[PDB]
Design a protein around this ligand. Structure first.
Ligand code: SF4
Ligand code: SF4
Ligand code: FES
Ligand code: FES
Ligand SMILES: [K+]
Ligand SMILES: [Zn+2]
Lengths: 183, 124, 112, 70, 696, 160
């Protein structure tokens, strides 16, 4: 998780870039508020923020400004929410997201080797973005796959019990479009 | 003139001259504080009527000197550590954050630190 | 107390005729949250309408002809200050300190 | 006695064992300004230093302008 | 209700539901704290106030733990002192070694508590180094050095709750938590600069005051703030002849330890554009003249034009003191003239509230009682500008109870929610007889607030008649134990001028083409008629439009340079205190009038302050009770409310436009303050810009 | 001997006592106090221990400059020691030493603040000069010069 808590407007991100939900995302958003009482509808920022994240690709400033507008909140109470949680991407982030747990229960199964194996193929370090924008490696804390320790996480999938020779199957395939089966 | 000699500026306009006694300092014409009394007005006084203004103390203005230093550039780290380059004979150790795309000067020394990756934009 | 004790103090007559003293208790400073400098009563003299401070021409000092500018007295009871002011025959005026009004503060109040 | 240069003024008083011409380059003072000939005490001359206030006055009087009624 | 408890053997009796720290502070035991402030919501994160309770292993945050009955509270166990030094050893782990270059140097709570409650040695020689943060830019008034923040959230809690500026918060997590605004935008509140006082460390400091003084140099003088009519109690710090900074001081009835950004950052106007020498107009320019020559010229000029009985006009400015008002009022009547008024923009010759009854032109409910009001009606007032601190008082009530605020006038961006009703007299007419008027009568202590800007409209008399008609026919609005009608003033010398009746009630006199005009600090006379053949004298302390029109200019002293009397909007009589001397040969304001009289053959009886202070007893005997309000007796008040009701008044339907069209330029000192110039460029005339173009 | 202070209890030294109470006796005692000082001075040269020269309490003693410029709490204490001072617990005292002139003592009154409330200085010469009239009674002008010298009247102490 990249811990910077001051946003700088880029050519790719600024409040001047409009953001509007798609026709489908309105239906989900209208029904997402259905889980919260009328006098506390502001609790639905976390769903809408990630819901709006997927429509655009990441958690842009326009998303936070739009989400605040939707729920009648000052834009700061969304900024506090957005930067507290580690699954909101405040950057283009590219296509895929490799999450490599490096915690101790995972590190007991040679979780270092998976890190070296990935860094070899893509010519990138953790927390970096590939020159093609297809991939963006990212270290991560515990994901729950500790009993099946040496686990990689791509987007939202699972690949447990891996080796540097297990990394050859996936890193080659995703460029070709042949995505292996998660699990 | 008396227009530059009596108003403080961040940078001068004309090249300073060491022989000109009306300059604020031998290496700077205009004063460097809003409340600093100009040297031209200071010496236009009765007590200087029969003096030799060339022999009064004229230390070199420290603002002009400090900006003649190069900018330190840090490699693969956004935090600079400065201590006055003397340790126990310098200023207290202060850590400078270089996230912003500019050169952040040290609070005591006045040395300006930046990132290497930001040098090209800074040097524009 | 009742005596005109100033006739034995040798102080200049102008402290009785021409100057005004003030009996006050120092107020709490906004910057700091300490509450100790506001527990002793003090006496200070008013400044002069001219000649309290003027810039020295040569070195830019702060010249003054007020010989009471740096005189502050300390007490521990309000009455002692008033009694002492009465004894010297000072033309004082008392500044009653403000009293903060109590308001109970509860952690749970942020939601109720 | 004010004609003795400051570097040697310390050596003469048995304050140091290394004369200022035998100084290590990592012990010389670094001056970023030109150093001129030594100037002795200038009292009883015209070069005697004159003190002055280095601060501007603290109040700026009004720059008067006249405006005429309609 | 009260629960009796002992703290370190001292019996404590406090209200139930209070926290331990208030109980301890009442017993005299001092419990160190950073994050606890007695005007903010309780956060329990700084962990410095920890105490030990007898029936527990777990240390209690005394700022959060509510009080019990029969509880035994310990504060000086060796276990506690170990905790206090542990916490101190943590705050200073990342704190920079900035004390020499830090503007909080001699007055920083992190220094004094660390000295008192922490260890005398540090155990942090780590080679990685401390944490470094980038300073955020949040305007031209607050200078941020976020390296020094101890993450205590006083800035966040104040700005969110008290100030109503939700753009300030905590962005990030853990060791990278960064107080700020996330994106770069300036903080927009008229009370934003009070955060400078709350921030216990050097993280948030004054930008105008930066690097100029250390707190042990300054001399603290307790006086009042006269940039607006509330008369907030302030503390003026002077280093010799200059006034360095202005801070609030505790007064729970008026300001409650806050001052608006105009009040504190307008101190630098006192060093600019000052009138220091008497000036006499020659040709189209001014020349310097002595008090002998300037007083003679006014005496000579007065006899040249020979103004008649009521051809002498006296105009009093907003900042003018009460002693000069009576000195001038007596002087003009000593010449036999009653063309004495103010420089405001009132329409009807007898001002709608009048000067006969005090109850019709003050804040009869008193500010300290606005807390217990049930319903408030705003009539043509924008408290966010006219009385900034009073606006924050109404918000604090509206947040802790079910107070509902009703507004009639021009709609404005307000800190608290409004119930808008309309923008003309007829809009208020239906509202009084409609649903909202029913709400007020059912309530115990409803409030009706009339602004100062109501008079400056064409329908000045209609609104006063309309609202009084509602007041004159109720029992809840005016009781023996309540007086629910209030008027909000904004110029600091209205109530003083009206208490002494410095106002003409003759419409023909107010239309007289006066020849000799004596401007007493009046600087807004653009609409006011000044004929080309009038000899005008301006006595003030700043050079502005009032001095430009003058033919002889007599320098005067600001409120920080003299002892004077001011009556705030609610009728409280407050006397300033002298902090410095007037610059140059500038004299006292009421002393000029006495000296001018001796040249004009109207030698006034007064010779000194005490003689003149006896005169204030004559004009109104309540003007000798400082910091004491003389409320209007209930019976006599109801007489005044009736004479405001007048059948045969036409409502012209004029929008009740607020009179303050620029929050920062309102008085003479504000227009000459360099810092206020930055605010207008950065924030705007209405504090509405969110981006600072002026940034370099 | 009566109230030993500052390592005067560790060294061994004698004192000399007169018998005639005249100037010659006081001359001899002082010349003995010379040689007893030279006897203590040698012992302090031989018994000098290592360690701190000041209280290891940064709230009353400034921290070393090197520690000041590197440790945060040292900088805070260095700051408050040189501007605010250190507070002294309230009370009063009367501390006397064997000054070379005689018994010198101070009566310091504290108020819990950083500045002494009162400080009376008891200068030995001041009490001696009072007894000058009682001693010079019955002596000649050349004898007065001896009595002043035998009293050791440095008038900074007399006119404190
Ligand atoms: S905030 Fe206090 S402790 Fe921190 S640097 Fe400033 S003066 Fe020192
Ligand atoms: S900036 Fe100041 S007020 Fe805000 S949390 Fe930090 S220390 Fe507290
Ligand atoms: S420790 Fe790696 S998933 Fe839990
Ligand atoms: S004062 Fe209680 S934890 Fe901060
Ligand atoms: K501060
Ligand atoms: Zn440095």
């Amino acid at each position: 998780s990249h811990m910077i808590s001051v946003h700088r407007d880029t050519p790719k991100d600024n409040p001047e870039i409009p953001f509007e939900f798609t026709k489908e995302n309105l239906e989900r958003a209208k029904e997402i508020i259905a889980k919260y009482p009328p006098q506390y509808k502001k609790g639905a920022v976390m769903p809408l923020l990630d819901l709006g994240q997927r429509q655009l690709g990441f958690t842009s400033i326009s998303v936070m400004n739009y989400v605040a507008k939707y729920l009648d909140m000052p834009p700061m109470r969304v900024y506090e929410v957005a930067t507290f949680y580690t699954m909101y991407n405040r950057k283009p982030m590219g296509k895929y997201n490799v999450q490599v747990c490096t915690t101790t229960p995972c590190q007991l199964c040679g979780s270092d080797g998976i890190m070296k194996a990935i860094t070899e193929h893509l010519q990138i370090r953790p927390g970096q973005t590939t020159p093609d924008n297809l991939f963006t490696l990212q270290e991560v804390e515990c994901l729950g796959a500790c009993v099946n320790a040496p686990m990689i996480a791509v987007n939202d999938d699972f690949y447990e019990d891996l080796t540097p020779e297990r990394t050859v199957e996936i890193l080659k395939g995703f460029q070709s479009g042949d995505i292996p089966k998660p699990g | 003139s008396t227009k530059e000699l009596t108003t403080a500026r961040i940078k001068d306009i004309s090249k300073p001259d060491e022989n000109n006694l009306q300059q604020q300092a031998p290496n700077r014409i205009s004063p460097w504080s809003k409340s600093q009394k100009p040297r031209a007005e200071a010496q236009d006084n009765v007590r200087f009527a029969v003096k030799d203004l060339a022999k009064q103390p004229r230390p070199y203005a420290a603002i002009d000197l400090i900006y003649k230093q190069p900018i330190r550039y840090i490699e693969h780290d956004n935090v600079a550590v400065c201590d006055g380059n003397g340790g126990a004979q310098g200023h207290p150790k202060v850590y400078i954050n270089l996230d912003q795309n500019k050169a952040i000067p040290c609070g005591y020394c006045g040395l300006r630190f930046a990132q290497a990756a930001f040098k090209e934009d800074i040097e524009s | 107390t009742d005596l005109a004790k100033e006739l034995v103090s040798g102080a200049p007559k102008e402290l009785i005729t021409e100057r005004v003293a003030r009996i006050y208790q120092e107020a709490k400073a906004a910057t700091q949250s300490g509450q100790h400098n506001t527990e002793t009563w003090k006496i200070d003299w008013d400044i002069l309408n001219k000649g309290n401070r003027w810039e020295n021409d040569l070195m830019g000092y702060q010249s003054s002809s007020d010989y009471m500018q740096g005189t502050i007295l300390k007490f521990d009871t309000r009455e002692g200050a008033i009694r002492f002011a009465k004894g010297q025959g000072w033309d004082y005026y008392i500044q009653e300190p403000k009293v903060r009004r109590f308001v109970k503060k509860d952690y749970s109040a942020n939601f109720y | 006695m004010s004609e003795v240069e400051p570097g040697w003024h310390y050596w003469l008083a048995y304050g140091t064992d290394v004369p200022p011409n035998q100084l290590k380059p990592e012990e010389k003072s670094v001056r970023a300004y030109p150093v001129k000939k030594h100037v002795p005490n200038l009292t009883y001359t015209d070069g005697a230093y004159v003190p002055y206030n280095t601060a501007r006055p603290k109040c700026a009087t009004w720059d008067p302008k006249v405006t005429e009624r309609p | 209700k009260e629960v009796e408890l002992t703290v370190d053997g001292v019996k404590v009796s406090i209200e139930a539901g209070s926290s331990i720290i208030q109980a301890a502070e009442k017993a005299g035991v001092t419990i160190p704290r950073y994050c606890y402030h007695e005007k903010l919501a309780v956060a329990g994160n700084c962990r410095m106030c920890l105490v030990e309770i007898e029936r527990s292993p777990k240390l209690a945050a005394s700022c959060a733990m509510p009080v019990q009955n029969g509880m035994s509270v310990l504060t000086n166990t060796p276990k506690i002192k170990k905790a206090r030094e542990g916490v101190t050893e943590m705050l200073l782990e990342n704190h920079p070694l900035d004390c020499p270059v830090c503007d909080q140097g001699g007055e920083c709570d992190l220094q004094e508590q660390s000295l008192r409650y922490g260890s005398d040695r540090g155990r942090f020689h780590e080679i990685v180094g401390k944490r470094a943060v980038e300073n955020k830019a949040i305007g031209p008034l607050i200078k941020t050095s976020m390296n020094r923040c101890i993450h205590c959230t006083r800035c966040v809690r104040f700005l969110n709750d008290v100030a109503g500026a939700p753009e300030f918060g905590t962005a990030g997590r853990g060791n990278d938590m960064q107080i700020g605004t996330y994106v770069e935008r300036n903080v927009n509140s008229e009370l934003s600069a009070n955060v400078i006082d709350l921030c216990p460390v050097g993280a948030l400091t004054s930008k105008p005051y930066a690097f100029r003084a250390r707190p042990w140099e300054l001399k603290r003088t307790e006086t009042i703030d006269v940039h607006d009519a509330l008369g907030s109690n302030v503390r003026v710090d002077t280093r010799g002849i200059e006034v360095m900074r202005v801070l609030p001081r505790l007064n729970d009835e008026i300001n409650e330890e806050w001052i608006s950004d105009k009040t504190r950052f307008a101190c630098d106007g006192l060093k600019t554009q000052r009138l220091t020498k008497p000036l006499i107009r020659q040709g189209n320019t001014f020349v310097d003249a002595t008090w002998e020559e300037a007083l003679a010229t006014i005496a000579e000029g007065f006899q040249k034009v020979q103004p008649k009985e009521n051809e002498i006009k006296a105009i009093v400015g907003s900042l003018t003191d009460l002693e000069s008002i009576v000195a001038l009022k007596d002087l003009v009547n000593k010449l036999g003239s009653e063309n004495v008024s103010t420089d405001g923009d009132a329409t009807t010759v007898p001002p709608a509230h009048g000067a006969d009854f005090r109850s019709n032109y003050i804040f009869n409910s008193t500010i300290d009682n606005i807390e217990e009001a049930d319903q408030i009606l705003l009539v043509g007032t924008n408290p966010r500008h006219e009385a900034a601190v009073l606006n924050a008082r109404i918000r604090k009530v509206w947040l802790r109870s079910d107070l509902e605020v009703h507004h009639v006038g021009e709609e404005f961006d307000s800190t608290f929610e409004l119930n808008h009703l309309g923008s003309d007299v007829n809009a208020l007419a239906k509202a009084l007889t409609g649903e909202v008027g029913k709400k007020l009568s059912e309530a115990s202590k409803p409030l009706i607030i009339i602004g100062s800007g109501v008079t400056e409209t064409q329908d000045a008399e209609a609104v006063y008649a309309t609202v009084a008609k509602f007041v004159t026919s109720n029992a809840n609005i005016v009781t023996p134990e309540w007086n629910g009608f209030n008027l909000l003033h904004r110029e600091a010398s209205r109530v003083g001028a009206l208490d002494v009746g410095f106002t003409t009630q003759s419409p023909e006199v107010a239309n007289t083409k006066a020849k000799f005009i004596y401007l007493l600090g009046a600087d807004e006379i653009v609409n006011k008629d000044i004929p080309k053949d009038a000899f005008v004298v301006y006595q003030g302390h700043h050079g502005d439009l009032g001095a430009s029109f003058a033919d002889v200019i007599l320098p005067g002293s600001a409120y920080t340079e003299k002892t004077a009397t001011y009556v705030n909007t609610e009728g409280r009589v407050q006397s300033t205190r002298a902090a410095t001397n007037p610059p140059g040969v500038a004299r006292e304001d009421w002393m000029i009038i006495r000296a001018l009289s001796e040249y004009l053959g109207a030698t006034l009886p007064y010779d000194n302050l005490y003689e003149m202070r006896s005169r204030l007893a004559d004009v109104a005997p309540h003007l000798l009770r400082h910091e004491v309000v003389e409320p209007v007796s209930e019976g006599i008040a109801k007489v005044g409310f009736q004479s405001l009701v007048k059948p045969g008044i036409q409502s012209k339907g004029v929008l009740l436009k607020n009179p303050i069209e620029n929050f920062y330029f309102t008085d003479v000192i504000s227009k000459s303050s360099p810092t206020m110039a930055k605010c207008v460029g950065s924030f705007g005339s209405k504090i509405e810009k969110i981006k600072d173009e002026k940034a370099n | 001997k009566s109230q030993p202070y500052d390592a005067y209890d560790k060294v061994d030294f004698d004192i000399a006592v007169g018998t005639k109470g005249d100037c010659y006796d006081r001359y001899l005692i002082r010349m003995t106090e010379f040689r007893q000082s030279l006897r203590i001075i040698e012992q302090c040269c031989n018994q000098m221990p290592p360690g701190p020269v000041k209280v290891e309490d940064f709230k009353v003693a400034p921290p070393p400059r090197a520690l000041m410029k590197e440790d945060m709490e040292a900088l805070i204490h260095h700051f408050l020691l040189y501007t605010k001072g250190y507070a002294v617990p309230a009370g009063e005292t009367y501390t006397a030493i064997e000054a070379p002139k005689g018994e010198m003592a101070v009566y310091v009154v504290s108020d819990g603040s950083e500045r002494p409330y009162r400080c009376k200085i008891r200068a030995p010469g001041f009490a001696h000069l009072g007894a000058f009239d009682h001693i010079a009674r019955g002596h000649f002008l050349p004898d007065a010069v001896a009595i002043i010298g035998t009293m050791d009247l440095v008038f900074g102490e007399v006119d404190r």
